Design a protein around this ligand. Structure first.
Ligand code: AP5
Length: 192
């Protein structure tokens, strides 16, 4: 526990399809951070066949936010499972609300960096549609896209302004080619 609490922790925040997972995989290979995706954890619980998984599946297929306690407990347990060995943690897709950040800080520890993966709204819509047309997830349909984006703009963008009060946000232009985005992310990571 005091081990995870004192670890470097990076929050990765950005709209659906903005390129969070993409950039996080490149961080892992280059710097050796531990990548925890809130969405991957939740989808793994869905695939387990549990009753909790059936309810998560419903929530996610509607594009809605899973309750804080559910996602936070999964993230904590996944941090613990990898605590022995981390150079640091990339928490991808959490927090999605201010209260999510605040509870993570109370239970786990503070973020040193918030990578704000910043894509245009229409770029996200097009990206999520392109994925949807070629083997996307079940939530990559048009109607669910609308709800995922709405919640990002209303609930999640406030997270940026929140952690901007402590100067830890770095804005990453995720409209550039993947490798050019990564060069900006490297600049941010090297500050740690
Ligand atoms: N904290 C939380 N609290 C409550 N509920 C939660 C929660 N976390 C999750 N949930 C629930 O789970 C759901 C799923 O959430 P989750 O899976 O966490 O998040 P997401 O934002 O929906 O995941 P995406 O995979 O759509 O986006 P990504 O930004 O990682 O993009 P990627 O790199 O793949 O890239 C997308 C596409 O774009 C392309 N691309 C990426 N970067 C670039 C680039 N620079 N140039 C060109 N194309 C690019 C990629 O090839 C790819 O095709 C939520 O809606 C909610 O229901």
């Amino acid at each position: 526990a005091d081990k995870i609490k004192n670890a470097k922790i990076v929050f990765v925040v950005g709209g659906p399809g903005s390129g969070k997972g993409t950039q996080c995989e490149k961080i892992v290979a280059k710097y050796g951070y531990t990548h925890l995706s809130s969405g991957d954890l939740l989808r793994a619980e869905v695939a387990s066949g549990s009753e909790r998984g059936k309810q998560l599946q419903a929530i996610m297929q509607k594009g809605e936010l899973v309750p804080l306690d559910t996602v936070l407990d999964m993230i904590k347990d996944a941090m613990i499972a990898k605590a022995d060995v981390s150079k640091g943690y990339l928490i991808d897709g959490y927090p999605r609300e201010v209260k999510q950040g605040e509870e993570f800080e109370k239970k786990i520890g503070a973020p040193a960096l918030l990578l704000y993966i910043d894509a245009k709204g229409e770029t996200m819509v097009k990206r999520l549609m392109k994925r949807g047309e070629t083997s996307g997830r079940a939530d990559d349909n048009e109607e669910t896209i609308k709800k995922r984006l709405d919640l990002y703009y209303k609930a999640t963008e406030p997270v940026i302004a929140f952690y901007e009060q402590r100067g830890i946000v770095r804005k990453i232009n995720s409209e550039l080619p993947v490798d050019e985005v990564f060069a900006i992310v490297e600049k941010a990571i090297d500050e740690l």
